[PDB]
């Protein structure tokens, strides 16, 4: 579930663009965790969250993205 997310922020980037929609809130819980400092604890890639802002956030408010992350 992290990896299902951790790639999804860095490719489809949906939280940066889409939202999952009312159904499959299991994917919408994710809106919570992604804010967490310790998020990518298990994917063995702590710098994903850093990696994502390099992408996407340059297109708009790179630290407007930070409020979504930290």
């Amino acid at each position: 579930r992290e990896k299902e997310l951790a790639r999804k922020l860095e490719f489809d980037g949906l939280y940066i663009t889409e939202q999952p929609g009312d159904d499959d809130v299991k994917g919408q819980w994710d809106r919570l965790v992604l804010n967490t400092p310790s998020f990518p604890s298990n994917y063995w890639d702590k710098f994903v969250k850093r990696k994502v802002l390099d992408k996407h956030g340059d297109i708009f408010g790179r630290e407007r993205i930070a409020e979504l992350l930290g």
């Binding site: 340059d58 297109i59 708009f60 408010g61 790179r62």
Partner: protein
Amino acid sequence: SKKDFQKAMDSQQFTGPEIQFLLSCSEADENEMINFEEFANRPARDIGFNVAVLLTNLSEHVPHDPRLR
């Protein structure tokens, strides 16, 4: 404002000389401010349709000619 649009364009990245060209190509309406909706006319799209059609038509008909690529 045209300067604020010049600052907005630094990120969201079109090349900067082209940015100044957007400023000039806008309207410079009301001293220094610009509408978005008026600044969408170019209608023009058909040409570019046909261009992409053309280039795809080439990349299909004439593959691996690297300058074209």
